[PDB]
C-alpha cells in the first residue's frame, strides 16, 4: 500500500476501459443517465513480479487489500460510484489485472435545440490525481471499450460507445489530473411525434381558420377563442413535465408562432366584423377572402424559415 | 478462498433457482420492477468433502466468509441487489447449498403496442464470470425455481415464472461468462378500461355528432369545438403520466383517429353553412344527411381495420 | 453459534409479538404502509441456562454475535427491515428473550370497492426457516402485541392490531416454514368527501338539468356540454392520483352513470330541437316535460340500486 | 459494556438537550419535517473515574464502542436517525458529555381546520428503555435546549424551540420507559394568499354576479357556467397537492360555499328566464333586482359566520 | 488521537478550501442544490514533524486512522455528506495536508422577489467544534477556493465561487464554534421568458380587449369570461410546480394585476350592455371608446410603476 516505484523517471500509466452492461433511467429534465458497467484497470506494479516456474502459477489472484489500486474517480456522478471488484490478476511481470463492475447516475448535458429530430453526446469522464512519489496517467485499452448488443434506451437509437484515446492532463491543487473522455452517441428515435404532437395541434390551428369561410361574429369569436383554450389545454396533455429550457428550441419556436397566429386571427375577425359594422362589406369581404390563402402561406413560409435557421 | 479444482478438464456447474416471494412496484413508465425473492445456488467443492462418521454430522454449515461462493450478479439490476445470507450447507460429498433472500429493481423493456390488450414477458438476467483456473457455468434446477401463490401486480394476471434452461455462454474480455434468462410472464386486465375510458371518451365523440341533427352554426361550432375540449380535459383526467412512447400504439392510432374525426366534423359544419349562405340547401341537406351514417360507418370500419392491423 | 438441541423429538417454538409504536405513510396507489415497532422474540436455548446462586445473578446479558439467534424475516416487506437489537437477556433457565426496534415499508393490498366507505386490513407476515438439525415454529405472546395509543393514519380510525395466533407451517423447498399474520384493521373517515367531491359534482349535473326548462337550442348546447367540461375539471380537481384499479369501484360506477347522464341529456336537447324544427312541437314539450322528473328519478333510483349493490 | 451501579437504589439519570442546528422540508401532506440537530447526552458512569494527576489530562475523550452509552432514540422518526458522534468526554468524577450531530425526517401530525392562519407545535419524542440491572430516566439540561437564530422554515414564523421538563415515564413490556417532550411551534405566513389565492377567486365568484344585470339567458348561461369552468381551472392552478383532509377546513367551507353559490346563481338565471317565457316579466324583474344585492349580502353573512364559527 | 499541543496559548487554526466539480440539482421548491466537490484541510500537528534527512522522504503518507484530523462539519447539508479521503500528507514541519472528495445536498434560501431577472447568493456553510485541551478556529486558503470551468447549472449564469475569509467565531453549549460562508454567486438566464411566458399571456389578454370594439354583449361575454379561462389555462401549463410563497414577488404582482384586469373589462362590458339596453347609446359608446385608451395606457402605466418599485 505505496505507489509502484518508477525504472527510471517515467508516470505510471493506467490503461483503463468501460464496457456497458446496461443503460437506463435516461432524464431530459434532470440531464442525468444511469448505467450499469465494468470498469477495467491495467497498471505495472513490479514490487509482484514473480518467477511461474519457482510459483508454480501463471497468474496470481489478489483481494483489494493486499495490493496498491490507483483511485480512479468519475468526474460528472451524482453520488460516488457503486463498485463491486470481480477480479484483480497478476501476470509474472507484475501487470496487475483488475475488473470492477459499477452502477453510476452520470451528469451530462443536453442540447434541445434540434428536438425532436436532436442527437446527444452523453460523457463519461474518468480522472486520477497524481500523488507525491510518482505521477499517474491514463490511457485507452481499446480492447477493453465497448457495449453490450442489447444496451437500449427507450426512444433512442444508440449509434456509439468510444473513447477520447488522448487523456486531458492538468494540474489541480498543485497535483497533476490524467482525465479521461468516453462518448456515448445517441440520436433521437421519435417518429410517433408527427400522429401525437405535431398533427392533433395543426388541426386545431386549422379549426381557427374555418373562421375565413364565416361572417357569424359570435361564430367566429367561439371558434377562434375556444381553438385557442384547446391548443393550450393539447399542451398540457402533451406536456414535456420539463422545466422551461433557457434557450429557444425549434418546436419553442413553432409554438410561439402558433400563439402570435392565434391573435392574428382574432385581429382579423375582430376587424372584419368592425368593417361591416361600419358599413364597409367591401373590405370586410376582401380581408377575410385574402386570409383564406394568407394565414396558409405565411405559416408554411414560416415553418420553412425555422427548419432552415434550426437545421 | 481459491475455485474448486476440475477432477478433469471440465467447468464448474452451479445450479441455480429463483424463488419469487413478492413482486411489487411494476413501473410502466420506466420499464422497472422489484422483487423479494430467494436466490439458491449448488456447486461441487470437493476440498469441502466429509465422512459423516468421523464428522458425526449428517450436514456441515458453514459462514460465506469460511468457503468459496461463486460470484453470481444480475445483469439487468438498477442498483446491487440488497442480499442476505438465509443458509449454506456441504453434504458429504461436497455439494455445497448456498440460500439467499434478496430484493431488486429489474430493468426489463415493455411493448405497448397492443395495451391495454397487452401481455409482458418481464425478465431476470443471471450472470457468472469465469476464473483464472476454470470455467463457471449456470445450470437451472427446475426444483429451486417457482413462485409464492400470494405473489400479485395489481391489474396484471401473472401467468407464470420459469426459466431459459439452456445458458447463453460467450466471451467477454477474454475470459467465458455464463448467462441464465428468468421470465415472469404477465397479462393485463383490460375490463375496467370500457367504463373507465373507452365509453366515455366514445360519449363525448357521439354528442359531437349531433351536429349532423343541426342548421344552426352557431349550436354546431359549440358542439364539435366544446366537444373536442371536453375530449382533451378527458383525455388529462385519464392520462398514463408516462412520456411519450417512441412508436405507434393501438391506443395511439384510435386517439389520433379521433382528433382526425373532429377536424373532419368542423369541415362539415364549416361546408353545411357556407352552402347554405350560399344558398344551396339542397347540398348543404344532403351532406349533412350522409354524414349521419357517414361518421359512425367509417369510424367502425376504421377501428375494425386497426384492431385487425394490431390483433 | 448452531441451534439449540431437543430434549426429545420437539420443535423450537419461537415466542413474537410486534408492538406499533408509529404508523405512518399509508399509500393506496403503492398499496403500502410504513411502521415502526417493537418486534419481540422469546425462545429456550439450554446451552445457556444457569444456577442464578452460583452467578449470582437473575439474569445475564448477551451480544447477538454471543448466541445463537433465529432468522425471523418478514414476508411482504419492500427492502429488508432496518433493525436494531434494544435487548437480549437470558433467564436461568435458559429462556432467551430478544426485543429489537424496527422499521418497515409493508406491502399490504387494499380493497377500493366500497371507496370512500371502506375498511381494510393491513397484513405483516412474520416467518422462520426450518434448519438442518431442527425445525422452528413460531407462536404468539399476547402480552408482548399491541400498539401505542397515540398510534395514527390520518384519514383512518385504527380499530384493532391483533395476530392469528396458529402460525401457517408449510414446505419451501424441502424446508419447513412457520408463518405468522398480523393484522392492523383501519377503517375510513368519509365525511369531508360528501361537501369536498359529492355535493359540487351532484350541483354540475343539476345545472346541466336546468336544459329541461329552456327551449333555446343555443343556450342547452352550451349548458349540457359546458357542465360536461365542468364536470372532468372537477374530477382533474378532486384526481385520487392513483394508477386506474381493475375492478370496478362503487365510486367508479357513480361516476360512470354520470356521464351516460351527461350524453342522454344531450340526446334529449338533440330530440327536443329536432321535434320542434320538424314543426311537432306537442312531441317537444312533453319529452322536456317528463325528462324534468325522468332525470332526478331515474338518477334517485339507480343510486339507490348501486348503493344495495355495492353495500 | 453494561450499565453503571447504582451507589443506593437510584435510577440513572441521563440529561438530554436538542439544539436545532437546520429545520427543513415540512411536507404539509406526508406531516413531516427534516431536522438538523445536537443531541447532547450527560450521565455519570463512576466505572470511568480517573486521576488528573496520575492521567495527566483534566478530561479524557473516549471512543463509543469503548463505553456504555445509554439507548437513546426517537418515538416519531421515519427511518432511524442518522447520527454521528462529535464528542465524548469523561471528567475525573465520571460524568460523561456525549454530543452527536444528527438529521431526523419526524413524523408530526398537522391541524389545517383554521388553514391559512393556523399555527402549529411540532414535536420531538425522546425515549430510554430502561435495562435489567437498574432502571434509567431522562432529564431536560436547559441550558443544552435551543435553536440556531438562522432557522427557518419558508412560508412561517418559528416562535419556539422547547421542552416539556418532565419526562413520562410508564411501563412497557414489563420495563421502565421514561418519554420527552420536545415541541417546535411554528405559526404561518398568509399575506401573499389574499392576492394569490382569495382574491382572484373573487373576481371570478362576482363576474358570475354581473347576470343579475342582463335579461339575455344565452349570455346568462355564459356568464354562470363559463366562470364556474373557471373557478374550477383557478382552482387547479391553486392546488394545495395534498390528499384530502378527512375533516372539514375554514378554506374547504368557503370553497364550498362559493360551489354552493354558483349552483344558486343558476337557478335565479333559469328562474328568471321561465318567468320571462311564461309572460310573468314582473316577477322575473323583482327577482333578478332582489338578487343584486341578496347575494353579496348573504355571501358577506355568511363568511362572516363561518369566519366566527373557525376563529 | 488526541489534538496538536499549542506553542504558546494560541488557537489551532485549520486551512479550508473547496474546490467545486459539480453542481446539480438546483430545485428552487425545495431550496436545496447537489454539489461534489473537494474539501481540502491543512493544520500544523508538531507531534507528526520529522527530519527528510534522517527519513529519507520529503513527504510521508498517512491514513485517516492513523492520525489527528479535525472534525468538520457542514451547518446546512440535508444528510451528513458522502465524503472520501482523496490523500492526507505530512511535510518535515509536521504540517497535515487533508484532501477528501465529497457530495452534499446543500439547503440555501432564495429570494424570488425579483424573479425572473433574479440573482441568487447560494451558501455551504464549514463549522468546527473546539475541544476541550484547545480552541480552533477556520481559515480560508484562497489558492484551494476555486471551481471546474464546466460547473454549470441550467438557466444560470455561474458568477462566482467564493468565501467570506472572517470566520464567525462564537460560543455554542459552552464550547467555541469556528463558522466559513462559501458563496456562489448565480443569476437567472431570463429570455425565453419573454416568447415562452410573457408574450402568449399578453396576447390573451389583448384578445379580451377586442370586445372595446364590439357591442354584442354576446360576443363580448364570451370573449372576457373565455380569455379568463385561457389566462388560467396558459398559467396551468407554464405552472412553476412551487409551492406558493409566502411573500408577494414581481411575477405575483403582474398576474394579480391581469386577475384585476380581466375583472375591470367584464365590469365595462357589463355597463356598456346596461347603458344600451336602460337607451343612453351616448353613454355606452363614450366609455367603450375611452376603454380602448384607458385599458393599454392604464396596464403600460401600471407595470412601469411595479417594474420600477421591484428594481
Ligand atoms: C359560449 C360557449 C359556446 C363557449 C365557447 C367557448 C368556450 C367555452 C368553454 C370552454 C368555456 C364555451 O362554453
Ligand atoms: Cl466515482
Ligand atoms: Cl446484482
Ligand atoms: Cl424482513
Ligand atoms: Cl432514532
Ligand atoms: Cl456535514
Redesign the pocket.
Given at each position: 500500500v505505496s505507489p509502484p516505484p518508477p525504472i527510471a523517471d517515467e508516470p505510471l500509466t493506467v490503461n483503463t476501459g468501460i464496457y456497458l452492461i446496461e443503460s437506463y433511467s435516461l432524464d431530459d429534465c434532470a440531464e442525468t443517465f444511469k448505467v450499469n458497467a465494468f470498469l477495467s484497470l491495467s497498471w505495472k506494479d513490479r514490487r509482484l513480479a514473480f518467477d511461474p516456474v519457482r510459483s508454480g502459477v501463471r497468474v496470481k489472484t489478489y483481494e483489494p487489500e493486499a495490493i496498491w489500486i490507483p483511485e480512479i474517480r468519475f468526474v460528472n456522478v451524482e453520488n460516488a460510484r457503486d463498485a463491486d471488484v470481480v477480479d484483480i490478476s497478476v501476470s509474472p511481470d507484475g501487470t496487475v489485472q483488475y475488473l470492477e463492475r459499477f452502477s453510476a447516475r452520470v451528469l451530462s448535458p443536453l442540447d434541445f435545440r434540434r428536438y425532436p429530430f436532436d442527437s446527444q453526446t452523453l460523457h463519461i469522464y474518468l480522472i486520477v490525481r497524481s500523488v507525491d512519489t510518482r505521477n499517474i496517467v491514463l490511457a485507452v485499452d481499446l480492447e477493453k471499450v465497448g457495449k453490450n448488443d442489447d444496451v437500449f434506451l427507450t426512444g433512442w437509437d444508440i449509434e456509439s460507445f468510444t473513447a477520447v484515446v488522448k487523456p486531458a492532463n492538468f494540474a489541480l491543487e498543485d497535483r497533476l489530473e490524467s482525465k479521461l473522455d468516453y462518448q456515448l452517441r445517441i440520436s433521437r428515435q421519435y417518429f410517433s411525434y408527427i400522429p401525437n404532437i405535431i398533427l392533433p395541434m395543426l388541426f386545431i390551428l386549422f379549426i381557427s381558420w374555418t373562421a375565413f369561410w364565416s361572417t357569424s361574429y359570435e361564430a367566429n369569436v367561439?371558434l377562434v377563442?375556444?381553438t385557442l383554450?384547446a391548443h393550450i389545454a393539447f399542451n398540457i396533455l402533451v406536456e414535456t413535465n420539463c422545466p422551461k429550457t433557457p434557450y429557444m428550441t425549434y418546436t419553442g419556436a413553432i409554438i410561439f408562432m402558433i400563439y402570435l397566429f392565434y391573435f392574428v386571427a382574432v385581429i382579423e375577425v375582430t376587424v372584419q366584423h368592425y368593417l361591416k359594422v361600419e358599413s364597409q362589406p367591401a373590405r370586410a369581404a376582401s380581408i377575410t377572402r385574402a386570409s383564406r390563402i394568407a394565414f396558409p402561406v405565411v405559416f408554411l413560409l414560416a415553418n420553412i424559415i425555422l427548419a432552415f435557421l434550426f437545421f
Amino acid at each position: 500500500v505505496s505507489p509502484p516505484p518508477p525504472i527510471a523517471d517515467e508516470p505510471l500509466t493506467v490503461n483503463t476501459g468501460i464496457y456497458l452492461i446496461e443503460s437506463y433511467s435516461l432524464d431530459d429534465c434532470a440531464e442525468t443517465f444511469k448505467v450499469n458497467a465494468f470498469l477495467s484497470l491495467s497498471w505495472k506494479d513490479r514490487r509482484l513480479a514473480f518467477d511461474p516456474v519457482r510459483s508454480g502459477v501463471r497468474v496470481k489472484t489478489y483481494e483489494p487489500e493486499a495490493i496498491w489500486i490507483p483511485e480512479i474517480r468519475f468526474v460528472n456522478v451524482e453520488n460516488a460510484r457503486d463498485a463491486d471488484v470481480v477480479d484483480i490478476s497478476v501476470s509474472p511481470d507484475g501487470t496487475v489485472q483488475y475488473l470492477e463492475r459499477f452502477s453510476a447516475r452520470v451528469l451530462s448535458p443536453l442540447d434541445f435545440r434540434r428536438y425532436p429530430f436532436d442527437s446527444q453526446t452523453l460523457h463519461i469522464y474518468l480522472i486520477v490525481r497524481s500523488v507525491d512519489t510518482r505521477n499517474i496517467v491514463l490511457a485507452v485499452d481499446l480492447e477493453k471499450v465497448g457495449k453490450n448488443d442489447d444496451v437500449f434506451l427507450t426512444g433512442w437509437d444508440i449509434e456509439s460507445f468510444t473513447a477520447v484515446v488522448k487523456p486531458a492532463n492538468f494540474a489541480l491543487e498543485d497535483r497533476l489530473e490524467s482525465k479521461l473522455d468516453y462518448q456515448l452517441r445517441i440520436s433521437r428515435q421519435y417518429f410517433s411525434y408527427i400522429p401525437n404532437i405535431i398533427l392533433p395541434m395543426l388541426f386545431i390551428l386549422f379549426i381557427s381558420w374555418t373562421a375565413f369561410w364565416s361572417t357569424s361574429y359570435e361564430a367566429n369569436v367561439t371558434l377562434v377563442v375556444s381553438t385557442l383554450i384547446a391548443h393550450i389545454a393539447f399542451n398540457i396533455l402533451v406536456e414535456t413535465n420539463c422545466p422551461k429550457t433557457p434557450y429557444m428550441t425549434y418546436t419553442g419556436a413553432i409554438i410561439f408562432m402558433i400563439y402570435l397566429f392565434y391573435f392574428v386571427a382574432v385581429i382579423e375577425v375582430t376587424v372584419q366584423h368592425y368593417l361591416k359594422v361600419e358599413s364597409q362589406p367591401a373590405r370586410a369581404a376582401s380581408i377575410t377572402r385574402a386570409s383564406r390563402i394568407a394565414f396558409p402561406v405565411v405559416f408554411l413560409l414560416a415553418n420553412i424559415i425555422l427548419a432552415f435557421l434550426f437545421f
